[PDB]
Design an enzyme around this catalytic site. Structure first.
Site, PDB file in Angstrom:
ATOM      1  CD  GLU A  52      -3.063  -1.233   2.191  1.00 60.18           C
ATOM      2  OE1 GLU A  52      -2.639  -1.003   3.358  1.00 60.18           O
ATOM      3  OE2 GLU A  52      -4.210  -1.711   1.974  1.00 60.18           O
ATOM      4  CB  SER A 103      22.419 -10.783  -7.252  1.00 62.20           C
ATOM      5  OG  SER A 103      21.528 -11.561  -6.474  1.00 62.20           O
ATOM      6  CD  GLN A 105      24.545 -15.059  -9.625  1.00 60.79           C
ATOM      7  OE1 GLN A 105      24.810 -15.363 -10.789  1.00 60.79           O
ATOM      8  NE2 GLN A 105      25.473 -14.825  -8.728  1.00 60.79           N
ATOM      9  CG  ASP A 176      13.190  -5.412   0.323  1.00 62.59           C
ATOM     10  OD1 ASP A 176      13.843  -5.917   1.270  1.00 62.59           O
ATOM     11  OD2 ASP A 176      11.979  -5.695   0.108  1.00 62.59           O
ATOM     12  N   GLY A 177      17.517  -4.444   0.019  1.00 67.91           N
ATOM     13  CA  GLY A 177      18.708  -5.257  -0.203  1.00 67.91           C
ATOM     14  C   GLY A 177      19.323  -5.906   1.018  1.00 67.91           C
ATOM     15  CG  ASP A 203      11.420  -4.219   2.889  1.00 71.42           C
ATOM     16  OD1 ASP A 203      10.226  -4.209   2.481  1.00 71.42           O
ATOM     17  OD2 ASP A 203      11.928  -5.128   3.600  1.00 71.42           O
TER      18      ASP A 203
END
Ligand SMILES: Nc1ncnc2c1ncn2[C@@H]1O[C@H](CSCC[C@H](N)C(=O)O)[C@@H](O)[C@H]1O
Ligand SMILES: Nc1ncnc2c1ncn2[C@@H]1O[C@H](CSCC[C@H](N)C(=O)O)[C@@H](O)[C@H]1O
EC number: 2.1.1.285
Lengths: 242, 242
Positions: A52, A103, A105, A176-177, A203
């Site tokens: 949202e 990635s 991965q 968001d890593g 995030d």
């Protein structure tokens, strides 16, 4: 309509509409609402409140004509990026691209020279779940009929891909890593592209010490005083005003 | 918009968007497209082509202002009826009801006095999959945000519920009750309610001898010459013109 569509898309992407259980590695609506599990099959782990938030930010940049593309750095099965493309479709926006950076991965193994906080987490051990191929992400976009020219992919490690990403300006930067290093590399390379009026979404801030470290250090270093606003039990965002 | 919404709804209901596998009792898109399996979790078994047929018929009755409510006799997890309600929502139609008719206990055991073709099939043995409670169906409607005043339920065996169902007129009658007796009881009680311009959809005609028997006998008995049109490898429909 566009509104019925986007409402349904959020429910489908998080798997609330079909009660998708948590990954083997039960379905509880309250947990899925706040993005506090990994869905077994659904296309995003971020939950309803964070989806949202994407909708609100992207609709605000469209409604205020803030220039720029949309990007997510760290995409997993691709659901947050599918939503971004769907919002553009719902509003018949033809002149913005969604950039899908990963990635494909999973999380990097930061090794002995990584940030201490990243080394301690050893999040690369979660790659059995977190590694999702580009072919799978592409297929997921195609499943929604949203794999088209306004979706672009940046495959590789952020340290390799972001310095040369051919992005001019950004209206929404969603990060968001999961790691200090991933977050630092995202901010350093992409924050300068964010338009005034645009948004940066983090995030995993409140409960991720290394991510919190990277965001706070970057903001302190560059005197970014635009206030952090909470989303749920985890995420925050800010709007650039200067 | 309404169109983006309904397109997505069809994909969600059949489980193509999340590649829902077939019930334990693999996902193959070609099989799901034609409704030739039982989804493990998705809300309808009828497949994409039969869902598209519902959409086309319901949109045609709306566009031509053919009077009447919509009904499905035999609903399983409720997905075909959820679509019907969603189409009404997409077009902001407030003066038609979707009637959801089922035992909510699976297929009846027709016993020694059943139609010979029904006895031979012993389809009540499939109730481990085919019995779905009204609570579950209601929850499924709620998951799409479509459980409201324009959805009404007719719980019980068709022989008990249909003669007194408080339905005045029908614009679409969708039949999916699997047996000669179920089909006969549906036609005898509900076909007289179908408006001129309305549609009768037969889910399982081509490959279901007892269902084919009931439809053909009813049409012959009442001199219904409106032609049967195919949908996929299983279903047919007709439009009432007289
Ligand atoms: N340094 C880095 N370079 C490239 N990808 C990275 C990275 N650090 C983390 N990732 C990616 O970050 C993702 C974390 S999970 C992302 C969740 C996703 N936003 C959702 O909607 O569900 C993984 O896909 C992982 O491969
Ligand atoms: N005589 C009868 N009375 C009431 N329900 C009946 C019946 N014969 C069959 N049924 C119901 O018919 C349904 C067949 S399955 C229906 C599939 C559904 N239309 C879908 O979209 O997936 C079951 O739910 C069963 O309970």
């Amino acid at each position: 309509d566009s509104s019925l569509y986007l409402d349904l898309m959020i429910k489908v992407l998080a798997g609330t509409v079909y009660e998708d259980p948590a990954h083997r590695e039960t379905y509880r609506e309250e947990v899925r609402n706040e993005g506090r599990d990994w869905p077994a099959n659904a296309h995003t782990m971020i939950g309803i409140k964070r989806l949202e938030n994407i909708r609100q930010c992207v609709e605000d940049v469209i409604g205020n004509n803030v220039p720029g593309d949309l990007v997510e750095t760290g995409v997993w099965r691709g659901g947050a990026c599918i939503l971004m493309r769907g919002i553009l479709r719902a509003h018949d926006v033809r002149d913005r691209t969604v950039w899908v950076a990963d990635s494909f991965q999973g999380i990097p193994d930061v090794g002995e020279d990584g940030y201490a906080g990243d080394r301690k987490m050893a999040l690369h051990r979660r790659n059995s779940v977190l590694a999702v191929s580009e072919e799978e992400v592409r297929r997921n976009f195609r499943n929604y009929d949203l794999l088209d020219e306004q979706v672009r992919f940046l495959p590789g490690w952020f340290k390799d891909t972001l310095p040369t990403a051919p992005i001019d300006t950004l209206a929404v930067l969603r990060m968001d890593g999961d790691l200090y290093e991933s977050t630092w590399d995202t901010l350093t390379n992409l924050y300068p592209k964010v338009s005034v009026g645009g948004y940066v979404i983090v995030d995993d801030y409140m409960m991720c010490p290394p991510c919190k470290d990277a965001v706070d250090e970057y903001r302190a270093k560059f005197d970014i005083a635009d206030e952090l606003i909470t989303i749920d039990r985890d995420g925050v965002y800010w709007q650039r005003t200067r």
